[PDB]
Design an enzyme around this catalytic site. Structure first.
Site, PDB file in Angstrom:
ATOM      1  N   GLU A  41      -5.510 145.191  38.055  1.00  0.00           N
ATOM      2  CA  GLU A  41      -6.479 145.068  37.424  1.00  0.00           C
ATOM      3  C   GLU A  41      -6.854 146.438  36.324  1.00  0.00           C
ATOM      4  O   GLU A  41      -5.847 147.771  36.990  1.00  0.00           O
ATOM      5  CB  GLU A  41      -7.558 145.112  38.386  1.00  0.00           C
ATOM      6  CG  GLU A  41      -9.045 145.468  37.949  1.00  0.00           C
ATOM      7  CD  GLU A  41      -9.993 145.654  39.048  1.00  0.00           C
ATOM      8  OE1 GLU A  41      -9.533 146.138  40.200  1.00  0.00           O
ATOM      9  OE2 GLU A  41     -11.607 145.353  38.734  1.00  0.00           O
ATOM     10  N   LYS A  70     -15.494 138.774  36.646  1.00  0.00           N
ATOM     11  CA  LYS A  70     -15.132 139.402  38.003  1.00  0.00           C
ATOM     12  C   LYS A  70     -16.634 139.336  38.158  1.00  0.00           C
ATOM     13  O   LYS A  70     -17.475 139.603  37.675  1.00  0.00           O
ATOM     14  CB  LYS A  70     -14.815 140.960  37.925  1.00  0.00           C
ATOM     15  CG  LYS A  70     -14.870 141.995  39.277  1.00  0.00           C
ATOM     16  CD  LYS A  70     -14.083 142.837  39.134  1.00  0.00           C
ATOM     17  CE  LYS A  70     -13.785 143.520  40.683  1.00  0.00           C
ATOM     18  NZ  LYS A  70     -13.646 145.158  40.548  1.00  0.00           N
ATOM     19  N   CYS A 122     -10.092 142.720  43.019  1.00  0.00           N
ATOM     20  CA  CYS A 122      -9.883 143.705  44.232  1.00  0.00           C
ATOM     21  C   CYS A 122     -10.785 143.329  44.894  1.00  0.00           C
ATOM     22  O   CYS A 122     -11.683 142.350  45.365  1.00  0.00           O
ATOM     23  CB  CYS A 122     -10.758 144.719  42.465  1.00  0.00           C
ATOM     24  SG  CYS A 122     -10.345 146.353  43.581  1.00  0.00           S
TER      25      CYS A 122
END
Ligand SMILES: *[C@@H]1O[C@H](CO)[C@@H](O[C@H]2O[C@H](CO)[C@@H](O)[C@H](O)[C@H]2NC(C)=O)[C@H](O)[C@H]1NC(C)=O
Ligand SMILES: *[C@@H]1O[C@H](CO)[C@@H](O)[C@H](O)[C@H]1NC(C)=O
Ligand SMILES: *[C@@H]1O[C@H](CO)[C@@H](O)[C@H](O)[C@H]1NC(C)=O
Ligand SMILES: *[C@@H]1O[C@H](CO)[C@@H](O)[C@H](O)[C@H]1NC(C)=O
Length: 462
Positions: free
Chosen positions: A58, A157, A190
């Site tokens: 990321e 995300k 994440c």
């Protein structure tokens, strides 16, 4: 094909310089291409060893120091993969998309699936009532290119970390998968790993075999170091898991690996150097899983292993646990908080006088830097001899364990079994989970123990 070779790369990113106003498109592209030069080295090296897929981190190509405007020049318009496009072979179909083009060619020329994280922009008008005032959406975006260079996945995300003010949240959670000759893949990024959508849905509803996971994770001991929690999630969810992390010790970023349902297969943790790292390992395309675990089964079947506990309060990552100290070199303890009772049987290899261990229980809502309901049973090394430090971040220890067995009366079936040794080392093959919900040792631990923990999420109570 029944097996494949997985690769993940931990990247020491080249960060843009701090400036006062946005850089030009041209400057942004030059920086991104400096990062892509390094990633190319990892991609080619992986392909040279027969890897079928490689994951990169990321924010790997432009870093994480942005507001909405300073980020803008780094963004491109990334189409929905349903458009059926190989950038390398059909440049200019979608205007100016040099980053997508280079990633496509890297995948095609090395005949390898490439997973990367870049930035998407979606222009909009005030006709769209959700359109931000400044005229576009900006998204943290995973892209996957297959071994022919075709764009096969795009994921925005969903669960932004506090301080990711440069990005928007999508309107609805995006459930993104891609199919290959070596299994069905899901993707998320994440912080997503702590939430239900899309992470849990991918496993539960879409039955993916493997997760690819770009991350830029800040390690928080005792329960949320990257290699620790990521490998545990894989074991608890019974999937393969390819974790590719940023390398930046300055912000406690390090911890990449390749994890299978039964055990970690490779991991890397390094707070000392500024080197990146490429890891490879074989995995099964369709992993076999044991019988489903009932996490409250053994724990609900027994009586308290101790009573008249001398109990105390301790803080673990801002949450108030109920602890009991381990007095003997061997013992059996039970401790409870609200609906959760936690049971531990143990034998240390030797009592280190100035080293204290405690058993802790938590059942409540976490609120700092995120909102989520937890149930946790933890054995841990207290930072110092003082009980007020049980739960504090502890990096090292000397006490090895000959045996341990941990369990609890979890009111959830989503529980992630963590074992972390001194110096932030995993313990592959050294422990197991039983069908009745015990996490136990198969032998004396190869190094000293920092924690053995059952980390549970009750997504419905968030
Ligand atoms: C209480 O803890 C002890 C260890 O301190 C448990 O006994 C263990 O010791 C044996 C040594 O040979 C092992 O072979 C046993 O397998 C082990 N017990 C378990 C459950 O793994 C003792 O059983 C614990 N008491 C319980 C579970 O009621
Ligand atoms: C940041 O500035 C340094 C010093 O001038 C330079 O060497 C480096 O290339 C710069 N990085 C970027 C991304 O411009
Ligand atoms: C892909 O391969 C050809 C080799 O001739 C070359 O034109 C192109 O630059 C390559 N791109 C990458 C990113 O490797
Ligand atoms: C798990 O076990 C408990 C107690 O042993 C039982 O009450 C419960 O029904 C079981 N749940 C599942 C899903 O097997």
């Amino acid at each position: 094909q029944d097996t494949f070779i997985a690769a993940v790369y931990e990247h020491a990113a080249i960060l843009p310089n701090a400036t006062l106003t946005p850089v030009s498109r041209e400057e942004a592209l030059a920086l991104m291409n400096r990062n892509l030069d390094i990633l190319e080295g990892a991609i080619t090296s992986a392909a040279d060893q027969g890897a079928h897929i490689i994951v990169t981190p990321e924010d790997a190509i432009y870093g994480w120091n942005f507001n909405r405007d300073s980020l803008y020049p780094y963004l491109e318009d990334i189409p929905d993969p349903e458009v059926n496009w190989i950038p390398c072979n059909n440049r200019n179909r979608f205007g100016q998309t040099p980053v997508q083009e280079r990633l496509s060619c890297l995948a095609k020329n090395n005949s390898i699936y490439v997973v990367a994280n870049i930035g998407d922009k979606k222009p909009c008008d005030t006709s769209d009532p959700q359109c931000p005032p400044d005229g576009r959406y900006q998204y943290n975006t995973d892209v996957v290119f297959d071994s022919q260079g075709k764009l096969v996945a795009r994921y925005h995300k969903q669960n932004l970390f506090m301080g990711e003010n440069q990005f928007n949240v999508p309107k609805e959670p995006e459930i993104v998968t891609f199919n290959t000759t070596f299994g069905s893949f899901g993707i998320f990024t994440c912080f997503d790993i702590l939430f239900h959508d899309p992470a849990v849905t991918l496993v539960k509803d879409f039955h993916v075999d493997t997760i690819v996971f770009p991350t830029a994770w800040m390690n928080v001991l005792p329960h949320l170091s990257a290699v620790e929690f990521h490998s545990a999630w894989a074991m608890g969810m019974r999937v393969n898991f390819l974790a590719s992390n940023i390398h930046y010790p300055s912000k406690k970023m390090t911890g990449s690996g390749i994890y299978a349902p039964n055990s970690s297969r490779a991991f890397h943790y390094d707070m000392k150097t500024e080197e990146g790292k490429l890891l490879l390992s074989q995995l099964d395309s369709h992993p076999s899983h044991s019988a489903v675990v009932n996490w409250t089964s053994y724990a609900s079947s027994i009586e308290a292993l101790s009573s008249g506990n001398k109990e105390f309060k301790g803080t673990v990552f801002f949450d108030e646990f109920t602890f009991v100290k381990l007095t003997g070199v061997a013992g059996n303890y039970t401790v409870c908080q609200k609906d959760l009772c936690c049971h531990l049987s143990y034998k240390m290899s030797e009592n280190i006088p100035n080293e204290v261990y405690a058993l802790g229980a938590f059942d409540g809502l976490h609120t700092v830097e995120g909102r989520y309901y937890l149930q946790i049973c933890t054995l841990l090394k207290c930072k110092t001899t003082n009980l007020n430090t049980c739960g504090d971040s502890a990096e090292t220890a000397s006490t090895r364990f000959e045996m341990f067995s941990l369990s609890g009366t979890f009111g959830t079936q989503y529980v992630f079994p963590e074992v972390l040794l001194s110096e932030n080392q995993l313990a592959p093959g050294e422990f197991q989970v039983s069908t009745d919900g015990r996490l136990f040792s198969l032998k004396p631990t190869s190094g000293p123990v920092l924690t053995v923990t059952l980390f549970g999420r009750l997504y419905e109570k968030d």
